[PDB]
Design a protein around this ligand. Structure first.
Ligand SMILES: O=C(O)[C@]1(O)C=C(CO)[C@@H](O)[C@H](O)C1
Ligand SMILES: O=C(O)[C@]1(O)C=C(CO)[C@@H](O)[C@H](O)C1
Ligand SMILES: O=C(O)[C@]1(O)C=C(CO)[C@@H](O)[C@H](O)C1
Ligand SMILES: O=C(O)[C@]1(O)C=C(CO)[C@@H](O)[C@H](O)C1
Ligand SMILES: O=C(O)[C@]1(O)C=C(CO)[C@@H](O)[C@H](O)C1
Ligand SMILES: O=C(O)[C@]1(O)C=C(CO)[C@@H](O)[C@H](O)C1
Ligand SMILES: O=C(O)[C@]1(O)C=C(CO)[C@@H](O)[C@H](O)C1
Ligand SMILES: O=C(O)[C@]1(O)C=C(CO)[C@@H](O)[C@H](O)C1
Ligand SMILES: O=C(O)[C@]1(O)C=C(CO)[C@@H](O)[C@H](O)C1
Ligand SMILES: O=C(O)[C@]1(O)C=C(CO)[C@@H](O)[C@H](O)C1
Ligand SMILES: O=C(O)[C@]1(O)C=C(CO)[C@@H](O)[C@H](O)C1
Ligand SMILES: O=C(O)[C@]1(O)C=C(CO)[C@@H](O)[C@H](O)C1
Lengths: 137, 137, 137, 137, 137, 137, 137, 137, 137, 137, 137, 137
């Protein structure tokens, strides 16, 4: 019924970073989420402690999370441990294809405790992640 | 307009392997592909040489491929080299979450030369992969 | 009651490869298997897709497998995934002592999902593998 | 004519460790060894220095050894160097399937200087190891 | 005379994470610390920058620290560098046994610049850490 | 009610190795163990086979063990396998901070099958280990 | 015309950490920067999210950055990704010689996407970094 | 007198893959092989089992092989084991310079059991390989 | 029109090292190079600085190089950097099959910046390398 | 008062290698060194033995060295051992950013025994290195 | 004045292992040690606990040790820790050249805490080790 | 009858590097070599090409070599290949204990093709190496 979309560091910068901005991204998600009969609560923070607080809320609330954690994907165990609490499905999103880049990008602390992972499908990955969650209730 | 869905070894065995069989899988894909205005040509082979021949056809034809190559994902460079020819988008599909399993499963020769990757969303990954390709023409 | 003996690539070549040929090997197994009150269905293929099809049959049928997969032992995850289905015991056979050779030979994708492993006892390993299966029904 | 069965540390504890005890194990081996026309001299020690002294005796005497060295398998070069002297066949036995366990268990200092290796066939591995030695004189 | 107990990310969640909550934990520490003739100043933050500021205070003040840094243990050099300043003893605490879990958990940037480490003794580790500090003034 | 304190090689040498000797150590433990309402049975051996025999006794008896195995910590799988039998809690003790020394010292075969680990708190670690066991019956 | 000097965690502590404090450091930079005809905007934060926000400003503004990111150098991909946006030159500064210390300090996520790197020249590295930027406009 | 030229997977695709096709390649080899007084029997297959059967024929026949095994070079031990039988010279051919590409391409299971290796000289490598074999009878 | 053949350390010793000496080698190359319509300028030095000076000349002159750098192949980046300047083709020659020897021999700093590589074809590799260069002008 | 600038192999080639030649480089250094009140003695050699002899002179003389050792940076321990003697400061210079290139370039035997390191600031690094040495007497 | 020669496991077997036996070895050492004005106390044990007890005696007594620890060289930290106590010189002896054998033999826990090491000079290494100790008092 | 003592780079510097100089070293060797009935031809060079030329002479001449190759020990394959020619014994000498230093010092390309190795016995190692060669003719 409710989905939490959580974006980590440097995901404010889309565009600036042919560029669809985060404000547009929120717009998209929220539209494609109203057709699915869902509500999308989309947030972005550069602060790990903020991201954690949001994932705590989703844990207590048992609402599924769609998480594009940015560069913390590859480095953060604190984040992963907060994700591990979640009882509702967790879906890991990457806009770029990470496996086509630096080799250090090919490890994710989050993948192994997520339900599943979408990578390289761009902005639409978010929308697809939504559609998975709609069809699994 | 046309999408090639290609399944590698042991993907005949779905079910037998709560189990949705491959025949059902073909049924699904072909239905969700008719709503998208697409045609889905879905095949499965245990033979690498067959898989290659199908990817050659898709290369010459420039039709996008959705490829769940099975255990050849982790081992086959021949396959990857055949995928590399493709001019149309390539999407890598995994039913199980591979990153939640054996560590050797977390390397894919295909990922780095694919457009993108879906993992752990089950049978639906195929359907989502479709939807990406529809929205990108 | 029935045992499947499956030999992978280059195991046709025994002798040619002091040499007991595969035809002799089949002869042996089938004799020592009649004394044990068993039936031995012994096959050999250079084709992975064939090997898989045979292991599929043994999976559906729930008949134990004795598998000397050759050089695919060290490289094939597809094979291992097909072996993983088996409900009846799986025994991995190696004629040569693999640990006495190249270091890459000392990893087997099959070992960890087999019941057990015989290595370096030559042609007789097959016969011993039989005897294990007889005494465990 | 004579076979030395040598068990390393913690192999006294079988049972205690559905459990067939070492005393039963000795009983087994000695019975299945009388049918083969062999004599089985079965010993067990937690002391490496004792194990070595027994392998020295077998070296001087040129009597084949069946050796389940326990956790010293994975760690001991001293043992391996004592085994290296043997002129009669050496067979390495493991009750559990070692490759199905911790990854550190998948290296054996003994394997490369043994004639061959049996793993995961339980208590019977000893009996099979016997049968190899009978048929090779 | 004064001890600083510092808990890192996700240590607010004890219980929720049979569960003794952090508020209970603070209660414990502060009780067992009054019997030892000590004062326990116990804090928790998800923010690394906050944790650092607290460790700066303890550095300037030369008051011993008991630090359970959470998932930052395994990843943070910034934290370790702040701990390195401390002149009073530093004790690293882990509730779970970390060595019994994922292999990446078995490296701690903090251990080598701590006085010592307690792991897997649960909530009591904190109390024991206290008792070390009491007996060493 | 009874605790087994077991010290491995070179732990006789405390002092000789500002030095509190083992005889003093036994004295300590036995005093702090009488206040806790416990009995401490403290032994030390340079012989692995002896250490194993003591851990066998504790296994059969189901009495908790406090084990400082010395340099066998880092090398011995035989020891670890004997510790694995224990049903009562096992606590691993290190006097020095091992993580502050050679890098090879930072792996312990014992840690992952122990209840927990104390490191770098000196002689007192033993006393703290006691106190854990008292409070957990 | 304008240079951004950005210092990461624990760089407030210079001195306390023969010690020239950060306030002195700012004093220095700002003096040697007025002789070069430049303006130096020098900031320090323990918060990664703050550091990122400052690097975002420098990215949008296209003003060169001199960045001593502290312990986040060795661990942070989020930081590196924010640095990657910069169009103006980026210079990485280290006061201590990092290659003369722990081996983990010899990898920097920042180096490969920086213009260049100064290491071990102490406080003056900042001043030299300035002088590079003056001579390259 | 006779040379076997064997091409592995995806070597049908030359051109399609400035492009000289395989049919042209066969044409070349067969021309430059008639001047050398040789006969060239050139085949190509995507099927490993076919490649093996051809190498078996060359083994029995003791006719030298020129082998460009494609992506199976880097992955196949079965192939290597079939090549190992050959008594006549084996020459490994690569059109592209493999060492100038992905790092995984820089290991060949075939190289160590070949007579020698040609890499990066393009289509002509085949012709040079011929010329070696002519001058060595 | 002109080819530079450059041999590194210990290549004076051919023969001494069934042995064709370097003087013979020069003789060969110069003969097979006159039939190809080429001129071969063949040199050998044990001195890296000399080898570099010769490769500098070939760089300035834009004349192709055939380089058998000896043991500097596996160790020298200085050499590789000098080879990198060359605009004319560079061909790496090895008399022995290097991949059939020590594992450290299987890395070449030169391979990745060469046009191509010949290995294990003996003295003739030089002659083949010539023939490549003739046919590519 | 005197500074030794020492350039290793292939640093003669600047320009040839938009290009400022070594002769220009010497010109620069010597000018910017006269303003600093210093004398710059700048040399370049492709010969390691020459470089060593120059560093021996600087060692005996106790005059600081600025050393851009070229490709010997990454490979030479002999050089590093000669640098280790120096009592006056040693500064390591790299024109290119080495960390932005091949991964093997990111280890320097010299860095850990140098005072400090400048990398990627081009020709000016030399001038900055000078300025460090002037301000530190 | 007194030297302790200590031989580890399997060093009883010299000869049996052209063979000079240990009894001869003791004879040698004791003769060449009387000419040097020394006394040689030569012992051998397969038991680590015995070896340790002897090294404890040499530690307390401050008499130099010549130690050929056999296969415990490569595996034993307990031994190394006992050797670390010694105040008198420790010399590590190996009869065979260990670096010419298996790669695992090329690490010695003892080397780094020994005064020095002799390897591959056969039985005489002992005599040379003596001569070092004579000339260093 | 004749022994070649060859010292590599930076071994001129003994003393300067309590210091016995090389001139003294030559003096020593030549004295202790006259008592042994030998002649010692002792040379030192910083030039690898010189060292090689000397080892070539010893190869042709079949006179044993005592080689302390300095930092080229750890890096040079060219040297090792020149040493490999020698028919007379080769003894590797190190003054310092190399295993007590940097970890990169614990690999020697020379050790595996030497007769044996002396390390950490200082200047006397040379004299002992002599004595080995005297007693082995
Ligand atoms: O582009 C993405 O999807 C990505 O997850 C985001 C960031 C941050 O921009 C990067 O840190 C990741 O490597 C990739
Ligand atoms: O389940 C999947 O999606 C998967 O791609 C398929 C197979 C084959 O069943 C496995 O070989 C892969 O590891 C995972
Ligand atoms: O000899 C065997 O038992 C073996 O399994 C078979 C082959 C193929 O001959 C090899 O590929 C294996 O390494 C070993
Ligand atoms: O169970 C076995 O066969 C085994 O060899 C025995 C021990 C000791 O119980 C373990 O140390 C080995 O890992 C496995
Ligand atoms: O449970 C612990 O003691 C621990 O330190 C805490 C966290 C965070 O909950 C984890 O990140 C650590 O891996 C283990
Ligand atoms: O000091 C300890 O606590 C320790 O467990 C003991 C020994 C043996 O003295 C060492 O072998 C260990 O590395 C550390
Ligand atoms: O001293 C430095 O220049 C340095 O960049 C700073 C810190 C933080 O003090 C450390 O984290 C770095 O390793 C080194
Ligand atoms: O181009 C070649 O020579 C090559 O051997 C062929 C293929 C298959 O095209 C690739 O799989 C190899 O990496 C390189
Ligand atoms: O034999 C060769 O072709 C080779 O290039 C030459 C030398 C030097 O003899 C060796 O250093 C190389 O490993 C191999
Ligand atoms: O460009 C440099 O600064 C450098 O030190 C020089 C050389 C040699 O040109 C290269 O060998 C180094 O990798 C980088
Ligand atoms: O031969 C030796 O000198 C040696 O130290 C002894 C043994 C035991 O024989 C081996 O375990 C060592 O690897 C080598
Ligand atoms: O001191 C030695 O014996 C040594 O061989 C010599 C040098 C060069 O001084 C060093 O390069 C070696 O690491 C050690």
């Amino acid at each position: 019924l409710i989905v939490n979309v959580i974006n980590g560091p440097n995901l404010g910068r889309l565009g600036r970073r042919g560029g669809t901005t985060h404000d547009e991204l929120v717009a998209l998600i929220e539209r494609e989420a109203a057709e699915l009969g869902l509500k999308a609560v989309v947030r972005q923070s550069d602060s790990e402690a903020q991201l954690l607080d949001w994932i705590h809320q989703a844990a207590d609330a048992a609402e599924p999370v769609i998480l594009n954690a940015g560069g913390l994907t590859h480095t953060s165990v604190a984040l992963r441990d907060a994700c591990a609490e979640l009882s509702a499905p967790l879906i890991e999103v990457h806009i770029s294809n990470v496996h086509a880049r630096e080799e250090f990008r090919r490890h994710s602390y989050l993948s192994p405790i997520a339900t599943g992972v979408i990578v390289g499908l761009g902005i639409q990955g978010y929308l697809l992640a939504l559609r998975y969650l709609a069809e699994h209730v």
